């Protein structure tokens, strides 16, 4: 995606502050060129993209779509990389199209784009070229979810971009269903340790593996683990097989990351169902299981590098000892000989870190003190007691040690003689409320956690994965979600065509072969190609009834669990199913912040927002207007003064506070005071009275 990603903007290129939508504009051509759908998103769509699918591109920056360059009801089985143009001259045949098994599309008449891409009908008998498949100006990412033909493009591309924002938790799973894209796509991960020779296996262990390159020949091909992303994730790279077995170049060797059974592990083929419930799947609301926990299903870990240099300067430089001023014990009783502790070590927030230290200064104190120190012999030193300490939402175990010295030759920026950088684990065990989802864009926050029991549940006991409000899709579109999921339980559950005597007609056709589903097993379909409703439906009719050859499921979609609480029956049958989804690089700690106070523009001393800082949210002006719509004055005013940067009351009432008392009533716009001055300044003098 990042790869293939494509636009036309920036250095020397456009400056979106100058471009008519047309820039973003649609147009014919476009097909076999780039995902129609996806794009940027903010003021950004119609600005960037990639390729469609196949058609290479000119030795000169122009696509190369080959085509079903037809010939006399007998397309010329032949690529023809094409620069749209030319071509443009030519005849737009149609993929999805019934030939007389010969090129001989069995109709006399057909449609086809024309001069203006005039998608025009016509008599089959006439084109030069058909196509190269269905589905092509598509994107991969595009290429990912069926039911399209039922579903919001908006919603779509939405999910599209979405798509990415999965988060390789841990388990590894694939939607039992899903097209072929998939690992055959995923393979284009070109990542998994994957065969290099028809060699027999050789010694194996999670670092690499010796590889009987059957030419005698071998090579303990490697394998990576525990090494951060741009986003804090392992180097994991899970194997496949057995140091002794035998296989052949290019074939797999070992997954690792987004790499379910050789394949982007990407979600959880997951039951759940249909109700909007007690207002909890309402307004985006979302109602969520719990067993999950326990189940664990939902976590990985994440990686900061952890750095802190040793510097050089005026009053001295930036030491990294382990000694410290009136530091607690243990607090030190922990780090290494001369600072920070030792790899894989647990913590929390605050947690001191470095073994740093630096000269302090030289500018006297009150005898009072010293005296005081003389009073308590705490003969103060004089060095800028300095180091590092863990902020918030932070813990795990020691990792990085990029402690790299200037002094030790480790080249580094000025006035520094070394620096380390470190890491720590933390398994994110999924908060509810948050958000996940899967296909049909069909995003989904993560509202409430909810114990198992307390849960609608198989008449055969087994309860949900969660449940699902209704409503959107209607004003949304994506019901495949429905279908697909029907499907879901289906597959998940398998069946067999009892065609027996004869043919399920709608059957009478199609990947026959299936005839059945060994209750639950691998299942793909084409994009703009896949069975149908009725069929599908009728598939509903079909079945692999369970243990008790049972199917609580209805040849209908709606069964009737009861309440894992109050328990009784329900009003009416129960729509339900399953859905793999994915998880999110976007939640609280991604954005979990406020700010009580901290740094403040040494100029406009406003909340020096920052890492250590919470930023301290900025405020808007409308807003103010809101006030107005009331007039809390003060309030605002206050602000302006207070948390704004009221040096005083900040200090002052800050005290007050401190002294908790009928607060230093709001003062005066001070500074404002300046003004004046500022004015005068130019012979400006005046005044109110």
């Amino acid at each position: 995606t990042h790869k293939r990603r494509l636009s036309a903007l920036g250095p020397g290129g456009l400056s979106r502050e100058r471009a008519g939508l047309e820039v973003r504009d649609v147009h014919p051509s476009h097909y076999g060129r780039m995902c129609p759908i996806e794009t940027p998103e903010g003021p950004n769509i119609g600005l960037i993209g990639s390729l469609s699918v196949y058609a290479r591109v000119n030795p000169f920056g122009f696509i190369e779509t080959p085509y079903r360059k037809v010939v006399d009801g007998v397309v010329s089985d032949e690529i023809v990389y094409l620069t749209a143009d030319e071509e443009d001259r030519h005849v737009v045949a149609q993929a999805n199209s019934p030939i007389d098994a010969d090129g001989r599309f069995v109709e006399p008449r057909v449609l086809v784009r024309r001069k203006a891409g005039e998608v025009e009908y016509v008599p089959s008998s006439e084109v030069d070229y058909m196509d190269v498949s269905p589905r092509q100006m598509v994107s991969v990412a595009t290429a990912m979810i069926p039911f399209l033909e039922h579903d919001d493009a908006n919603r779509a591309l939405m999910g599209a971009n979405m798509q990415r924002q999965a988060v390789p938790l841990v388990r590894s799973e694939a939607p039992l269903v899903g097209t072929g894209m998939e690992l055959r796509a995923a393979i284009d991960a070109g990542d998994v340790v994957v065969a290099e020779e028809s060699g027999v296996i050789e010694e194996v262990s999670a670092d690499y593996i010796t590889v009987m390159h059957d030419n005698g020949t071998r090579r303990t091909y490697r394998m990576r683990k525990f090494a951060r992303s741009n986003h804090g994730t392992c180097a994991n790279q899970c194997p496949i097989v057995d140091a002794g077995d035998r296989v052949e170049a290019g074939q797999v060797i070992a997954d690792g990351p987004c790499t379910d059974d050789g394949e982007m592990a990407l979600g959880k083929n997951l039951l759940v169902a249909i109700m909007p419930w007690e207002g909890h799947n309402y307004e985006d609301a979302i109602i969520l299981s719990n067993r999950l926990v326990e189940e664990d299903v939902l976590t990985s870990i994440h990686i900061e590098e952890h750095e802190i240099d040793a510097r050089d300067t005026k009053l001295g430089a930036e030491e990294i000892t382990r000694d410290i001023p009136n530091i607690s014990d243990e607090v030190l009783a922990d780090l290494d000989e001369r600072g920070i502790v030792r790899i894989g070590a647990e913590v929390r927030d605050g947690d001191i870190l470095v073994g740093k230290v630096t000269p302090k200064g030289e500018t006297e104190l009150t005898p009072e003190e010293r005296l005081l120190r003389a009073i308590f012999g705490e003969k103060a030193r004089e060095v800028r007691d300095t180091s590092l300490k863990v902020p918030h939402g932070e813990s795990g175990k020691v990792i990085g040690i990029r402690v790299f010295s200037r002094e030790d030759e480790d080249e580094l920026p000025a006035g520094v003689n070394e620096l380390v950088r470190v890491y720590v684990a933390q398994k994110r065990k999924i908060s509810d409320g948050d958000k996940l989802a899967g296909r049909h864009g069909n995003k989904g926050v993560i509202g409430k956690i909810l114990p198992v029991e307390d849960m609608p549940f198989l008449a055969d006991g087994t309860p949900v994965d969660i449940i699902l409000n209704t409503h959107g899709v209607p004003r949304r579109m994506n019901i495949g979600q429905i279908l697909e999921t029907h499907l879901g339980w289906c597959a998940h559950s398998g069946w067999k065509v009892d065609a027996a005597k004869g043919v399920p007609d709608w059957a009478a056709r199609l990947p026959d072969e299936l005839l059945e589903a060994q209750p639950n097993a691998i299942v793909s379909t084409p994009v703009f190609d896949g069975a149908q409703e009725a069929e599908l439906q009728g598939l509903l009719s079909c079945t692999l009834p369970n243990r008790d050859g049972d199917v609580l499921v209805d040849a209908d979609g709606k069964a009737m669990l009861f309440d894992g609480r109050s328990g009784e029956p329900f009003p009416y049958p129960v729509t339900v199913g399953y859905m793999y989804i994915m998880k999110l690089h976007h939640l609280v700690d991604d954005k979990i912040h406020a700010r009580s106070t901290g740094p403040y523009s040494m100029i406009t001393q406003q909340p020096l927002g920052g890492k250590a800082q919470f930023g301290g949210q900025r405020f808007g002006e409308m807003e103010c207007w809101a006030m107005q719509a009331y007039g809390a004055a003060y309030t605002l005013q206050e602000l302006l003064t207070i948390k704004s940067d009221d040096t005083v009351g900040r200090v002052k009432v800050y005290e007050a506070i401190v002294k908790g008392e009928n607060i230093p009533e709001p003062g005066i716009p001070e500074s404002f005071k300046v003004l004046l001055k500022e004015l005068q300044s130019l012979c400006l003098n005046v005044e109110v009275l």
């Binding site: 089985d77 690529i79 299942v523």
Partner: peptide, 27 residues
Amino acid sequence: NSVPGAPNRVSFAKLREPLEVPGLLDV
């Protein structure tokens, strides 16, 4: 097809593409 470690996510090919998957990436 043409997949060494291949399983089968049985699909719904109503059709055929003599063509097959490019390599992208190439680029």
